[PDB]
Structure formats: C-alpha cells, structure tokens
Design brief:
3 copies of one chain form a homotrimer.
Chain A (H helix, E strand, L loop, with lengths): L2 H6 L2 E3 L21 E14 L6 E7 L8 E4 L3 E8 L10 E2 L18 E8 L4 E6 L6 H6 L3 E7 L4 E2 L5 E2 L3 E10 L19 H8 L6 E4 L12 E4 L3 E8 L6 E4 L3 E5 L9 E4 L8 E8 L4 E7 L2 H5 L4 E7 L7 E8 L1
Parallel strand pairs in A: 1-2, 2-5, 4-9, 12-15, 14-21
Antiparallel strand pairs in A: 2-3, 5-7, 6-8, 8-9, 10-11, 12-13, 15-19, 16-20, 17-18, 17-19, 20-21
Bound molecules: copper (II) ion (3 copies) and copper (I) ion (3 copies).
Keywords (chains A, B): Copper, FAD, Flavoprotein, Metal-binding, Nitrate assimilation, Oxidoreductase, Periplasm, Pyrrolidone carboxylic acid, Repeat, Signal
Catalytic activity (chains A, B): nitric oxide + Fe(III)-[cytochrome c] + H2O = Fe(II)-[cytochrome c] + nitrite + 2 H(+)
Subcellular location (chains A, B): Periplasm
C-alpha cells in the first residue's frame, strides 16, 4: 500500500467494554481496511482477589484485570492511544503478540507517569492474541500483576470450520486467566504493602517457586460465578476467548464441549473438534465455539481441578431453555 | 430420537474388566444404535502406592484406580448403574466428559452411601473421554483420590487416519495416570490415616503446592511392570488409551513411536503422526496407535523423566519376535 | 534392505558443530540413501550456568550442552561412534527418539569409561527428535545434567507446508533448553561440589520439587546474547529447532511469530500457522519457520516469563535492514500528557 493509500483509510474510534464482555463489532468485515482507534488509561490500584481480603497492587489496562478485548479484522490497522497518568509510579508499555516489530510495540510505547503514546500496527494475522506490559528488567512482575489482555483479529469473511462452512456466534465472552503470586508471612497470612514497589522482592521470591497462590478469572476468585455468571440459551452459539499471558491453562466447559476449538488461537490453523478439554500455553490466547444443547448451570474451569476449585479458576454459565431427554436422562434418580 | 424410539432399541449388557485390559467390543459397530449397559460399584479402600508402604484412601470406581474403560460407538446410549454401598462414608457421583448436560451427569447422579442411580446419555461425539467423580465443594479431592477413569466412543466404522484409511488394532490397553498428594510428617515420612475424612485437611495443603508426591500408572509405582507388563509381538497393531483427570502428561514409548496419535483424544480431529512424545492436558484422554517393529523390553513413560523415574510414572511393554537389523544394529558392541 | 545393500550405500563422514549452529547439509537430499557417520566424545565436565558463577557437573555429548544437532534425511542410516573416555567416572549410553528398538539405542550403547560403541539405525520418520543419555537407575539425573540434544531427519524432498508448498530456509539455528536443579545452602546460595557423585542426593531432592532453579538455552543464562546473539536480516527465512528432553516449554519470538510451526516436531504432521507462542512437551523437539519483516532486537523466550526472565530462558536475535512503517509505526512517541 502506498503512503497516500494508508493515509486515506477510514479511521474509526471504538469505545471499550470491561471483560468478560466485548465491544460491538461485526463478524464479517464491513467494507475495506480501516484504522481502528482505541484508547486505554493505565491504572495502578489495590484490588482484592479472594474472600480473605487478599490484596494485589494491580497494574491494569483500562482499569481491569484482564485488560479489555480489542476486536479488528485482518489487514485493518489497530491504533492504540495508551495513557499513563501522573498518579502512577511505574513506567508502562504494551507488547501486542498480534503485531510485527519492536518487541510487539514494547520498544516504542515506554511511557512514564504523566506521558501518553500512540502506536499503530497492521493486523496481518487472523486469531486471538495476547497483549501485555513488558518493561525491560521487570517483564514478568508486570504481567503477573495483571497487566495483560487479548485482542481478536477476525478473518475479513468471519470464522469458518475446517471445511469452509461459516461459524457465526450469537455471543462472545472473553475470559482472561491470571496467575497471582502473593507473599505470605511465616504464619501463612497474605501480606499487604503500602506501595506497589514495596512488594517487589517478596513477590519475585514467590514467582520463582513457579507456584501461584491464586489462579483466577476476571481478576478475582468467583468473579464470574453466582450473580456474575455468564449467560446463554439452548440453541445459542457462543465463542469463548481465553487468554493466559504467563502460564499454561486447560479450559473445560463442565457439561459441555468445545465443538470447534482454535487451541492455538490462530484462525488459519484449522480448529480441533468435539473437545473435552483444550490446552492454551502460557503467553497465548485460544478460542472455543459451542452451541448449547442443555439448560442449567455450567461451570467453566481450568481442568487442573486444584487450580479450579482451590486456587480460583472457575466461572459459571447460566443457560435457559428446555431439557433434552434424548441427550441425557436420569433413568433412576438417586434412591435407597 | 423420541423416548419411544429409544425404548425400542436393543440392549447390550457389558461386563467390565480391570485396567489396563479393556472389555470385549467390536471396532466397527454391529448394527444400528443400541443402549449399552454398564454397572459399577464404588469402593472406598486403602491402596498402597509405593514400595515404602505409602497409603492412599482411594475412592475407586469398580474397585480400581483408574476406573475401567467403557467402550461404546457414536450415537449409542451409555446407561450406567452406579452404586454407592453402605460400606462407604461419602456422597459420590459421576461426570462423563463424553456427555452433554447436568455437569456431565454429576448433577443427576449424587448418591449417598446406601443409594444407587441410573444415568443414560447419548454418546454423540466420537473419542476417548475422561470420567470422574465431582461432589460439590470436594471436587479435586475426589479426583486425586483416584476417582476417575475413561470411556471410548468409537466411530461406527471404526478408526481411520486423517485421509480415511482404516486403522484396526489387534490389542488395546488403557493406562490411567494418577497424581497423588500424600502428606508427610516432620521427618519426611508419609502419613497414614484410619478413615478417608481424616486425611482431608493435610491433603489439601499438599494439593495447593501443585506438586504431586507420586505420579503413577494404574494406582501404584511399578503397577504396570513385572506381572502387569503389557504385551505384544512384532507386527501387532496396538492402541494405547491414556487418561489424566487432573494434571498434564506427556506419554512416550521408549524405543517406539506413536504412529498415529489423537492427542486431543477426539476422533473427528485428525491424528498427529510419527510422534516421539505426545501431550495430554489435565482433564483429558488421548490415544496412540503403534505397530511394533522390534522385539524386547520397552518402557512407556510420562516424559518428564523426574515424574517417570523418581515419582512413579513408568510402565513396561514386553514384545516377542525377530530382531530387525535394518532398523537398528550394533555395528560395534561396547568395547575397550 | 539387506546387510549387503546397506554395505553398498555411500558413506558420508560429517564434522559436527557446536549449537546453536548446525553442520553443513542439504535441505533436499543429494541422491539416494546414505550411511551418515558421526562421532561424539562424552565429557563429564564442570560448567558455569549463570553470571554469578554457579557450577554444575555436566554430562555433555561432544562437550556441549545441548549436544550438537545431527542432520540426515528420511531413510538414511545414522551411524554414531560414541566414545566414553577413561577420564570419565560413569557409564553412559544414548537413546535416539528417532530410532526404533532397544530403548532407542540405549540398550545397545551402554559404555563404561574407556569404552566405545558404534550404533546404526534407519531414520524412518521425518522430523526433529530428542536424543539423550539413559543409564538405568539414573535416567533423569543424566538428562538434567545436560546429556541431551536433538537430530533432524529431513524429508528427502525438503520441507513443505501443510498443503504441499515448498518451504526453504535461508539459515537454521538449534536452541536446546535445559532445566537445571542446583542445590542451595541455608543462605539460599548455590552449592559447589568436588565430584559429580557428591551432588547426587542433594540434586535428587531438588528434582523432586519439579521446580528448576535455572531454565537456560545453550547451557547457561544469557548464552545466546551479546556477541553470541543469533542474527538475521529483513526478508530472511529462519528455521529455529527447539528441544527440551525433560520438561515442557512454550517458545515465543518477541516482535515476531512462528509462521509455520511443527509443534510436535514431526514433518508428516502439518504445521500450525501464524503462531504467537507454541508448545513443545518435555521429551520432544519442535521447529518453527519465520520470515523476518522488521529490523532490530528480538528476544526469543520460553513464555512462562518467570522462566524467561528470572530463571534464564531468553535469547536474542539481532536483525539488520530497513524498518517497515506500514507494519508498525509510532504515531506519537512517548510524550507529556
Ligand atoms: Cu509476550
Ligand atoms: Cu471434568
Ligand atoms: Cu526419551
Ligand atoms: Cu505496565
Ligand atoms: Cu466420589
Ligand atoms: Cu550419560
């Protein structure tokens, strides 16, 4: 493309929405390539991540853990204005795994408190991709303090199965999974710290054990359960995007399946089918497509069940509709 | 199918056999869909898992760790009579990853001691699938106490490679891999308990380290060696089903390969080929197909070699037949 | 083939080179099957694995960690002369995951100090494959002491993508990733040992935690950085072979991708495409193919970033050439709000 051609492309501002929700978009690209414009403000803030009042000094894109899902189409440009308010204490940047060059954008986006930057990259590859902060000399600490999210680069013609049949979802959720490493005193009580930097040395010690104290969805134990369960109806087609910026995970829909799973997250690699449990390596995003067939409460988990039910990696779906006795039936209910 | 149509289908009662053996079945489906009937009694028993006399309070489907492999074909119905004897102390249930609805059957099969239940589900998706117990509030504890197995849902026309060529095995073995988390006293000696519930609190602390004390096949270190080594001959086609309900594994046949590997365990997902070491995520089953070409002793391991040779994850195959010097020869035997 | 037909085949003696470099070879096979001959001497040697001077008594094929990459084509015979010099103290052997029978060759290559052996096998399956020592009773200790490498069995017609299109690399690197388990004292400082045997019991304890103290490329923290960084140019096609004989890894090129990735390492299994981060399970090798599009520094890491940046699993590429502002541009450089 010529300089004038790039310059002439339409520019569109998109307002972001907090996870697990996803901003309005079209599955099939509406017209030619665009420069899609997003803005995110970085917030350093204390968050509580469990029922014991455990604190983390979060580093949060757009104020959330994970950061929001940005959606564009292949060969669009993504143009991010990233803002680091003067009230923050650390330099921050952004690495888009979807982008090509300068450490994914990290080398071009180092902003001190009181600074902003604008990065544009061409989204040449279709898929879901991780993004994360990566300040040289403290990369893992930034990432495991929650400074990560994902984007989706849809094929211009939307999603398809391995045989080129269209796969069109009715809704989409983004589940960001976070490993946290919270220091404890010798009595086993989680420690609290006045300033983010104060926790650095104690936290790295925990990190080096490679054993998270908490593994959570949407930034806290139980964030996506109970009255915050995700929703669907029988017959509804749902895409579940799942990311993990630092550590492996194995998602599983209890009572369901991944009908089509782009386990690697890349849409030019044909999806696996009929999956019980899929695998997303640390530093990647994946996506599963499922049509609900049964009503009721589902759990959606990391299928290391210790991580799911002891460490926090469990969400719910509440699904409306009619029960299908062909698929499953209690022939004899639990009885003496 | 309507209730009436289901009621009219032929019934077939199957008698289960202890792992690693697999009950009598046909690879190609005999006739139209049927209701395949299985019965399992839950046994809570002490198992010894290593040569140091270390004990686990097992929770065992059909009295074994893993539970037995159930084999059906796609679009058959699997009808399980699950029995929880008065000699047990805990509520138990079953989640079939192969099933659709009610948390894989777990919501509909909660049986107190002295109770039984019958669940029927349509096996709509072909592949190997995990099944496991999942009592709300105690899910990981049930699973890592050995309450898990697998089923195989064969395609009605049997197995095929990625290009439609038939793959027919002569032998089939089922390896269930188990991560155990056994508490230790202050001298590093493993603890013994006189009732299952007594170990709970201590065990949860070990589980939270995400570091198993033992990783075993068929419920114990060395279980599938010696009297229980798997057997074959040169020229024989062998299918090895492998499950792990809670934790990742990486199977490898030492001296062999996985000629065809359904690493995700799902038969509509084309198999990988010529594998050295495959990968099965926690909460899943996989299957490898191999034609033996050399006689001798083989080891079959989780290829984290610490897990294989320090923690217990190693089995043997004993293979009869003629040595093939074209494939491999000692040109100069070890010498000065 | 018969003994006689194999005897008639041409021989090719190859000189191995140290990782991350790879000995001269042809992507598309030159002529018919050959017996390709390699020699490696095993060295039990003290090595330094980080900038602090932490020592490990390594067990090293050809004196390097990892051992060197051997390259043959499908249905060639690989013929290895393996030597265990009298200066060593342990029995050693070799298991080629590429080979069929006798525990990958381990059953036939058990050599005490002062012994040698010659093993030949037919490389029947195309792909990259781990090889490693495996003395019964001491298997994981040998492997996590650095005694492992990889081989590449190219298809006779070179590489192709999943749809038959030829993929020809301009250069190839071999990154061997090593998990080390180094005992610490009550200060938390790494211990040093006079003899390899002295370290055994303390090391097995660390191994049991399943938590390495170091996770490194080419035998040490920072080994593939500075004047030892890998290099490329804009437009250059690079194959990166990556192995891990004992523990999972998740490779990622920061600023790039794996355009085609044989994540399982086996060339008859079609590659994944457009990968951000791929996965290679412990006991396997994988390979990624990438065409560089942008100049500058890249890091190549295990994307458990704690492993990458705290434990040592990070390498650098330095890439020359002209920057592409279409692909990426700083619309507004960091500046005051
Ligand atoms: Cu990254
Ligand atoms: Cu499950
Ligand atoms: Cu091996
Ligand atoms: Cu940051
Ligand atoms: Cu149970
Ligand atoms: Cu050795």
């Amino acid at each position: 493309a010529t300089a004038a051609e790039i310059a002439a492309l339409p520019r569109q501002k998109v307002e972001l929405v907090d996870p697990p929700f996803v901003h309005a978009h079209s599955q099939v690209a509406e017209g030619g390539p665009k420069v899609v414009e997003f803005t995110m403000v970085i917030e350093e803030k204390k968050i509580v991540i469990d029922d014991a009042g455990t604190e983390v000094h979060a580093m949060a894109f757009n104020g959330t853990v994970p950061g929001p899902l940005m959606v564009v189409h292949q060969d669009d440009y993504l143009e991010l204005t990233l803002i680091n308010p003067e009230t923050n204490t650390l330099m921050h940047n952004i690495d888009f795994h979807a982008a090509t060059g300068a450490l994914g954008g990290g080398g071009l986006t180092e902003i001190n408190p009181g600074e902003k930057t604008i990065l544009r990259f061409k989204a040449t590859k279709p898929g879901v991709f991780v993004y994360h902060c990566a300040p040289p000399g403290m990369v893992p600490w930034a990432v495991v303090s929650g400074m990560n999210g994902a984007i989706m680069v849809l094929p211009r013609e939307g999603l398809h199965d391995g045989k080129g049949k269209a796969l069109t979802y009715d809704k989409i959720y983004y589940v960001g999974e976070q490993d946290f490493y919270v220091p404890r005193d010798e009595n086993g009580k989680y420690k609290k710290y006045e300033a983010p930097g104060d926790a650095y040395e104690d936290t790295v010690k925990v990190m080096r054990t490679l054993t998270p104290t908490h593994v959570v969805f949407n930034g806290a134990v139980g964030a996506l359960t109970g009255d915050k369960a995700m929703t669907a109806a029988v017959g509804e087609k749902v895409l579940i995007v799942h990311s993990q910026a630092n550590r492996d995970t194995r998602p599983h829909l209890i009572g369901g399946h991944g009908d089509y799973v782009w386990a690697t997250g890349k849409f030019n690699t044909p999806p696996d089918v009929d999956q019980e449990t899929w695998f997303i390596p640390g530093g990647a995003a994946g996506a599963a497509f499922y049509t609900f067939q049964q009503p009721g409460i589902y759990a959606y988990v990391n299928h290391n069940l210790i991580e799911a039910f002891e460490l926090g990696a469990a969400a719910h779906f509440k699904v409306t509709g009619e029960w299908n006795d062909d698929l499953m039936t209690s022939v004899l209910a639990p009885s003496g």
